[PDB]
């Protein structure tokens, strides 16, 4: 509610862009950088104060290196102390999105426990604890069976960007339509 | 194809007149079809009137086609069958025409009495006591 | 000849809307349209007069109101001239109130083709509207038109005016007729929803037809009824056709 009506001041837009950049590393709930590509972080609000960090964050989120976390911003300001709780939450966010697009073109609530571990890059107990927190946070439900090794939780979350949302939508459309058309055809004929 | 009642009524007379004399199956099928499938009170009466003109030459057949229709629901229909016989069986003195017109003559619905009375008379013109006991 | 009264969808409805709310203890009002007579008279529209504390007489036609309403209608295409006047009244087969005739008679010195139509909402709650239209007789028209009529001839040389009933008909366009029957989207989408929730309730609906049948069989025994049973058999067939369709 600042930008589209103007009335702005170089001092104000300096606070807001830098303040957004620190807050966006410091905590999240949705996803850690896809929303900042439909989310002005430096799209002519101001480019000062080293907005490289936003792009550094996406590379850091994917690799999941500790060295990369220090070299993301600068040592102390990377850590906060915010990131000490944050890295696990941030961590699950990258895993969840990457799988959600990829595993089945339809989107079904079947995941291997193994391939959630392999993709997130964490040990067997640790992932057990991280998932345990993750169901608590919601946007999930339907009831994962912690024996049967079936991550069987329902499909219901928002899907990131207008990019591979659109690719995925075309595939899904041809299928939804085809299904309808068969039913219709058979009925029509008799 | 005009969705006016007057024009759909008017359509029925057009087959009767066009196809008159010797009868034609296509012509009777269309008229009976309107008579059954149209529920409009002018339209059903006109499509029954219309059968009598087609069928003037083959007049024997008109009591069988209209047999059903005379005992069928809606007074306009019943009115239309009186006329059908009246026009088609006029001068011949068909014994089968008269038998169908008898119930209709004392029908509750007033214009049904009326049209049967007109109808009886056209068939039985210059036919007398003794020749026919019924007159 | 004499009139046959074609009332439009919006005219019929406006007659019922105003009359119901204006109750007996009456509101009064004007009919709008025109015709070319001897078999075509059209009522296009109607509007309400605003309740006056002297019941529904000539004193209740507010001429400023009617004048302002006619002018404003005109500016939206809908204005036409008075083809008569309508109202709401106790309902009578000899004229709905005394006031409607005494109003009608003043009109009749001006016009010579103005009707009084009233619908009575007392008898229009048996699920069949009771609506009448009556006009008074005119000389030199209803004897020139419809031994001859001795009766109506002594009647017109006599009273000069007396009630006679005018026919109720309707006229509506095809455009209205098509786009009622897709309302009466709600119907199609509502139809899916209804099928789904019907299968939910089927647990009970099952059990009652089981009962219906037990009565049914018992009945036929006692007789030895048949008619019911057949109707009773047909109904059950219809319901299964529906149960199967659902699923």
């Amino acid at each position: 509610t600042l930008e589209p009506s103007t009335s702005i001041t170089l001092a104000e837009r300096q606070q807001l862009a830098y303040d957004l950049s620190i807050s966006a590393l410091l905590g999240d709930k949705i996803y850690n950088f896809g929303e900042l590509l439909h989310h002005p972080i430096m799209e002519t609000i101001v480019n000062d104060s080293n907005y490289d960090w936003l792009f550094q964050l996406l590379n850091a989120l994917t690799v999941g290196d500790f060295d990369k976390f220090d070299s993301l911003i600068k040592v102390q300001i990377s850590k906060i102390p915010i990131l000490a709780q944050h890295e696990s939450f941030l961590r699950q966010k990258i895993c969840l999105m990457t799988l959600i697009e990829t595993v089945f073109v339809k989107n079904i609530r079947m995941l291997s426990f193994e391939d959630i571990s392999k993709a997130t890059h964490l040990p067997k107990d640790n992932v057990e604890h991280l998932v345990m927190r993750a169901i608590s946070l919601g946007l999930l439900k339907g009831s994962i069976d912690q024996v049967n090794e079936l991550v069987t939780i329902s499909w219901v979350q928002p899907r990131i960007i207008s990019g591979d949302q659109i690719t995925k939508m075309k595939d899904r459309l041809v299928e939804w339509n085809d299904q309808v058309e068969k039913l219709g055809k058979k009925m029509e004929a008799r | 194809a005009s969705d006016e009642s007057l024009l759909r009524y008017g359509g029925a007379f057009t087959i009767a007149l066009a196809y008159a004399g010797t009868g034609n199956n296509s012509a009777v099928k269309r008229l009976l079809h309107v008579a059954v499938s149209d529920s409009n009170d002018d339209v059903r009466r006109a499509a029954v009137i219309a059968l009598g003109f087609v069928l003037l030459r083959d007049y024997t057949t008109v009591p069988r086609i209209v047999q059903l229709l005379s005992k069928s629901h809606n007074a306009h229909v019943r009115c239309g069958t009186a006329f059908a016989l009246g026009i088609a069986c006029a001068g011949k003195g068909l014994q089968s025409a008269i038998d169908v017109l008898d119930p209709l003559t004392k029908d509750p619905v007033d214009f049904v009495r009326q049209a049967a009375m007109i109808a009886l008379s056209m068939i039985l013109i210059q036919q007398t006591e003794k020749l026919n006991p019924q007159v | 000849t004499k009139e046959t009264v074609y009332i439009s969808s919006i005219a019929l409805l406006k007659m019922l809307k105003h009359g119901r709310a204006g109750v007996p203890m009456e509101v009064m009002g004007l009919m709008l349209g025109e015709f070319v007579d001897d078999y075509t008279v059209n009522v296009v529209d109607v509007f309400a007069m605003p309740q006056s504390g002297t019941g529904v007489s000539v004193e209740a036609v507010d001429d400023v109101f009617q004048a302002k309403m006619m002018d404003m209608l005109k500016q939206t295409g809908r204005d036409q001239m008075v083809v008569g006047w309508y109202h709401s009244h106790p309902g009578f087969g000899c004229w709905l109130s005394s006031v409607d005739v005494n109003t009608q008679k003043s009109f009749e010195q001006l016009n010579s083709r103005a009707v009084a139509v009233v619908v009575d909402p007392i008898q229009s709650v048996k699920g069949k509207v009771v609506i009448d239209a009556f006009r008074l007789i005119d000389t030199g028209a209803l004897i020139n038109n419809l031994l001859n009529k001795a009766n109506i001839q002594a009647l017109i040389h006599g009273l000069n005016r007396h009630y006679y009933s005018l026919n109720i008909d309707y006229h509506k366009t095809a455009k209205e007729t098509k786009m009622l029957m897709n309302l009466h989207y709600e119907e199609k989408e509502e139809s899916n929803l209804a099928a789904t929730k019907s299968m939910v309730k089927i647990a009970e609906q099952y059990s009652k037809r089981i009962e219906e049948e037990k009565e049914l069989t018992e009945e036929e025994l006692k007789t030895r009824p048949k008619k019911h049973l057949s109707e009773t058999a047909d109904e059950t067939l219809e319901n299964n056709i529906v149960s199967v369709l659902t699923a």
Partner: protein
């Protein structure tokens, strides 16, 4: 078990107590029972008429 107070059975040989009552199959059984009874009634009535 033998007048069906207990929802299960003894599986002897394992020596464990297991459910058999996966709730009541027969919950619309009585409604069916009447239904049979009506049909028999009908068949008898028709036969009289027939001859």
């Amino acid at each position: 078990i033998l007048d069906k107070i207990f929802y299960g059975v003894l599986d002897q040989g394992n020596g464990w107590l297991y459910v058999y009552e996966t709730p009541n199959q027969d919950a619309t059984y009585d409604s069916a029972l009447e239904l049979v009874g009506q049909l028999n009634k009908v068949v008898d009535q028709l036969f009289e008429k027939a001859s």
